[PDB]
Write a protein that binds this DNA or RNA. Sequence first.
DNA 1: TGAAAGTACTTGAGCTTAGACA
RNA 2: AAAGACCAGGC
DNA 3: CTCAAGTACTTACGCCTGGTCATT
Lengths: 245, 82, 123, 715, 114, 244, 209
Amino acid sequence: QEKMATNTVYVFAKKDSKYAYTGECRSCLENSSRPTSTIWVSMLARGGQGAKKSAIGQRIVATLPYIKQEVPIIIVFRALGFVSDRDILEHIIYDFEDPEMMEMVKPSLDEAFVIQEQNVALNFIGSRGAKPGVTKEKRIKYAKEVLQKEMLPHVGVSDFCETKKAYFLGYMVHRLLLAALGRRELDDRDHYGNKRLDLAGPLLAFLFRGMFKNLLKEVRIYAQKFIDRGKDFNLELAIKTRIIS
Amino acid sequence: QANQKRITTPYMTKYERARVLGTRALQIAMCAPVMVELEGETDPLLIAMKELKARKIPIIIRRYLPDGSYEDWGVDELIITD
Amino acid sequence: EAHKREWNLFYQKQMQLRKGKDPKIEEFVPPDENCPLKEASSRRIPRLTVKAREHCLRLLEEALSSNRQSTRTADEADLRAKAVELEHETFRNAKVANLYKASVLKKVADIHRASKDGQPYDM
Amino acid sequence: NNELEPTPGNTLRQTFENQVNRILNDARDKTGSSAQKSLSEYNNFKSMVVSGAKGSKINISQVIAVVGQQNVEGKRIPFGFKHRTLPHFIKDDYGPESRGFVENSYLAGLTPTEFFFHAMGGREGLIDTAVKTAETGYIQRRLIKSMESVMVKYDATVRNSINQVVQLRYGEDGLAGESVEFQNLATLKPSNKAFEKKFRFDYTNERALRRTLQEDLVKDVLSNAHIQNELEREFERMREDREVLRVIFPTGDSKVVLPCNLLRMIWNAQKIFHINPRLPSDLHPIKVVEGVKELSKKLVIVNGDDPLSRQAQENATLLFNIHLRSTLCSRRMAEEFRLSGEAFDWLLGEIESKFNQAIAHPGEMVGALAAQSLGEPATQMTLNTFAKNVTLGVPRLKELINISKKPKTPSLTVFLLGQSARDAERAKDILCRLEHTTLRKVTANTAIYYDPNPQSTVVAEDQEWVNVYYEMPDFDVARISPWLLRVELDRKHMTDRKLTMEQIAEKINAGFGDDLNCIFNDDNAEKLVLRIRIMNSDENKMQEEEEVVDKMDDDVFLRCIESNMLTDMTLQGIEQISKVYMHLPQTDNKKKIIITEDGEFKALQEWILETDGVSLMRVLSEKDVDPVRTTSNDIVEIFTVLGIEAVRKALERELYHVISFDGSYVNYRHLALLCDTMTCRGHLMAITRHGVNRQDTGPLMKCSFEETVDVLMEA
Amino acid sequence: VGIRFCQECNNMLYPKEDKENRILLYACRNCDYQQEADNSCIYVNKITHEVDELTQIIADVSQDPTLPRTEDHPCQKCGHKEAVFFQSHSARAEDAMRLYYVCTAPHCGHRWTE
Amino acid sequence: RDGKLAKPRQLHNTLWGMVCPAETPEGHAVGLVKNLALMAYISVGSQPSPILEFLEEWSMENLEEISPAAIADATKIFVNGCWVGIHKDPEQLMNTLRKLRRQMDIIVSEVSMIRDIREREIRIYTDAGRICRPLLIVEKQKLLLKKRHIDQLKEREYNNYSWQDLVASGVVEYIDTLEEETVMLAMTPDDLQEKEVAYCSTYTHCEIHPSMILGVCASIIPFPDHNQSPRNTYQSAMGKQAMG
Amino acid sequence: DDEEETYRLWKIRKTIMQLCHDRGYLVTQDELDQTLEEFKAQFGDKPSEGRPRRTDLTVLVAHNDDPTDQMFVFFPEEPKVGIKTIKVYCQRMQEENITRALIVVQQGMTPSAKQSLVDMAPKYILEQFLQQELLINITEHELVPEHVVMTKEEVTELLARYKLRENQLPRIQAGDPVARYFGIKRGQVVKIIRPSETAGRYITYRLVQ
DNA sequence: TGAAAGTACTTGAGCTTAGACA
RNA sequence: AAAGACCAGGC
DNA sequence: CTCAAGTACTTACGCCTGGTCATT
Ligand SMILES: [Zn+2]
Ligand SMILES: [Zn+2]
């Protein structure tokens, strides 16, 4: 079965979408768990958003998973613990001797004027989660977990992978900008170098992962229903090989 | 409408010819008396065709006008296309 | 088409406030005593002071004098009327002040060019 | 090395590709001609091609000489890899081998790269065949269900299920499309001198009459003045018919479809009765005239003695009567055909019988027949249309059928009235006055500087005219805004549209009030530079205390001003007109056809304008644009501008174009029925659920078309 | 034309106007920092963007085996015979089929267009 | 399959030698169902631990210890999509990686290594599902496949010398698609490698035989290059129905 | 510029008088073919701060059959016509006792203006026409065929001949540009004569609703 | 891993005022 | 076996 | 109260052959 190659950065341009140039990375973590968590980084065409865009085409924004609508890229970068704009630009822009790309990223910095703290950026993201947390701390925790675990898991998942995530997101924004300059050709979907083939191995692996997970869920259910007595527990009657078979 | 002031084509349409031939053939195959003389004709369709060529089919075609009126044309009154 | 009214409103409201209080400021000065300007008391071109038209007339006069000391025309008495007529033609052909000044400067070059072409500046 | 100049309307890449394609196509055509010239008479490929059983000349060319260029999506083989077609080729190789031109032929065998490129080329045809069929079938179903109840009633008026009149007579002439053939009027086109020489029957000669007419009839023709009067009346009526034809048929298209073939039965009468052209005829010309006049009465499409019925009959049979009087003319009978009297009577009888046979039979299901006759060619039509580009084939037919509010390529052809039609400079002037040219299209670069005092001129080159301009009684004394917006105008784009800074500054003033300072460099320079400031100061008042919060600091206010100028300045032309093309047409439909002083039809090559994007109202209102011939391919704006009958005609034209582009022919009555059923209720009714179910037909009629339960709920 | 950064919070400096002295000032809005603006220009827009590609062209491109190379045009600096050539290789480059040559041989890295 | 988008269905330049061009089903599935080429091999997957360990042992720099000011001139290093760091000498790194894959010490022959010179990226893929085909290796203008290899393969029986030993000798290399982007191939050695009117001199790989681009069903066609490509497709789809 | 507006006024007046002639109103032959120079001399060249103020450009015409009904063409000076303008202009309308008049708007009308326009049907009828729509004669376009307004007797004869009820005829909405051109109200029938390449001439009747 | 479009709904906005004569 | 889905294939 | 500018439904060839599978 054909499918898009995972963990790599692609840039596509839709004819009628509100995004002029869209960069996405279908990311999976070593195929160990979860199907895929994919992230979009796009540029808001040319039509005015009320009060800021009056230039050659800018306002890079992000679409995080489990977030209903768009989030500014600089706010996401600040949510990773990077406060100063120069560090964010260093992660995004690798050489400051090129002024045009800096001019294009400028209004994305302009949007994130209001959000200047890491914690307030995390609250900004968390208030835009699947369900808004009642308290500030719950939203902070939810946003931190989304940023750390589900958003771009292939670069890293555990704690201090924040710097690696920031570098990879900067690379994403850099590729999107390079597409905006036209210095890089738009990626072709039909290019077979961007496609992977799921043979018997990967397909049976995807099947067996969920099947064994369901087996473990049933074992846990049986164990919970049999432990309330407190008598004992035996595995042989707790396992239904019928599930996998 | 009345026999006077009839306005349709005096030619009989191919649809009228087809339906009148089918109806006459069915009647003939259901023991109706034949009008034209038959020379060893056991097939009702050819009998009906010969009847049409002789203008002896005892059928009048009621041509419905779009306004709800109608006009009665005998097969003999209509002139055969062939 | 929706943004046209939006931009019009935004521009007009953001530059109207720039005008500040007391927006009357007209004080149309009449021709003082001897302005060599046909229909000098004309308000057709807004913010076109009479002294500005006199300055343009003097610039045209200097251009015609430079042409005079390159082609040896008759005298200055007719050149005064020549400059007045050129200024009046430019004024009629102009509708706004900056365009009038631009047309005045455009004629001056043509003249100087003809003086460089050594030929008299004809009509 | 950049010696290739760009053809107007095309980028350098487009012109280079056009040149390469022209070279390769010319090479392939030359090789094919050389190969076909080398085939012997015994060659079986040639034997099959000349017979037309199967194959074609290009087939022999591909087999023997050269397969030819392979195209994907109407273009040369793309760069699937990084700036290279296949890894075997170097990057950025635009040569014929690298981009898919197959030098070898099928007999010689393709090289592996050529084999893969040919596989790609054939994949295009395979995909088109597999994918267009569904949409063509859906189009046929929609057309059928729209027309399925349209029928010819017994009064020959074509009516739908609700008895609403679609056409007064089927095909506007009342006759079926099976018996008609192509015929030439032979009266439309002939020079007035030739028309008179051919159709007058000059009886004064007294030698031609002896040669062509029998000796007995010559004295009868000459002596009686009533004969001459009737003949002159016949010629006058024929001249009036000539004028009517020239009104009906511009462009001088003499090929028309008519029920019975006059020349063929004239020839049949010659052969049946053994007519000898070498001998004088015994046919009296007055007998010919009277026979024609009597025959015209018995060819009845609309029966009735009412003046309305008489006029309807005359209009329905006008073209055929004109052709009959042209072909059955007395002079033509006496000179060319030489028919005898009995032969002429038999010919009249045959004409009457065949015309009566050709009349459409009441009860004929014309709606479904027209819908199928329209949908059948759509199956053989290509889904793809690939320097004006217009959608053709199945997508264009879909756009016309649905009347899409936004067609993919809406174009508007424009004709010029005066000298601009012939002269190229005025045509370019109209081109520039029609094409939308905003400020961005003409300026090279723009920048916002800081000039605290105008005399400072932080930019050096602007010192001269700046110190020229600010040395007058101006508003320099007050707080002239220190923020300067400086724009640079591209000389090439400046002179291409024949624009000047006076026009641009006038537009700036009109759009932004007199409170905006604009200063420019009166050309004759090196940088068509224009300087603009935002002068307001405060009319020489006291500083500024407690300024309003939304002051919009002049730097970012100049930002908004510059953006608005660069985006919505509309310096010239009309909006929604992206690009206007200009060329001299070579096809007669776009050429100017006039009637000379000799009455002949001559075609004049005049410049015409094709636009990307349509605004019919303003283009028609524009000076020197021909208001009569200007038209657009999209239908909605024609409905909103010119009316519903203009929509009928334009939709018929668009359908005819999209059908006959490939060379196919469909009889006119089906197109007329489709356009009439679409333009029947007074509005543009779409052939789709919204418009077929919008009619006031029966609920069971609608429930068979795409709605079912919804229509039954409403009922 | 470019972007200048603060030195206290390392944020972006936006142009401000010094009313009292009438000089262009770059004032960060995150803090109170203000600095003198040397260039006196803020924004430059080359919409026709007559940009030079050789400034965007890297020298290691000469190491590409997939690129064509000719000995016809030598290096201006080192005079090496063999040089790799390629087209613009850039989108939105208007209409340009011109050739951008890169000199081969190690440590040269010279580039020129003709 | 109901989708009318005709773009994905088209035969791509990217499918050369990778998927059979002629063979494809007919109907709504044209182009969307593809059968493998004769020489095409699918990457099975490998843990990218030894490659990362070698990269760490081969200098380079991680992302945590990197200075953002010195990353512009350096070339980024990607392993299975994840960004591991940068390297300042891409040429020698790529040469050593190629040598190691040729001799199969640390990098298995399945792993693909790509150097995008214009964009300064280096991508190393150990992922499963990548499609790859073997290709001969060219050094200078001569093949690495010599007479002795063919002599030993002629006696392949009772020799214990097979395709694996040929690959382990650094003669043949498995090149996937996005590495085929950075490769330059020669059709046949006896024609495109020898000196002629100069077209290319930097050939790095040569195809085994061009007929290997065809699939199982399209390989049985005699003289398939003399046929119209749609007819080759028809014969390919029809040979599955041939009776025997 | 100013000459552009002069040409606009001349073209609008020419099209308006052609429209009035097509509706059976007495229009002098010289007025129909009026050169730009002749109009410029008659109405005084530049309209901006000049002789023609868009007033006295108004046209009063009389119907051929009866000179009493007449018709009197309109030219509001404002870019957008309001209630007060049409109110005083209807005061003129009642002072002259005529019934039929037009409306030549520069850009558009307020919704209240349109509602007041439709308010009285029998007392006075007024038709609103955009400035742009009058810059060309749509009836002269090659696509638009000849339209003839049928009298009630002709409509009755047509219905009796074909035995059709009124709604069985083809329709044309009153908002059609050609229908507006002839000032046709709902219930009238327009006779349409167009050439055909099969019969030579075809007459179509379109009921207006 | 990548419809596309036409139609039926809502929802927000949003525009000088003053009394006498009239 | 019944209708449901899926798949492959012919024109 | 009342106009243009966002959110929901609704549909995408014609048959024809067969084989397999889970529910019933
Ligand atoms: Zn700061
Ligand atoms: Zn060098």
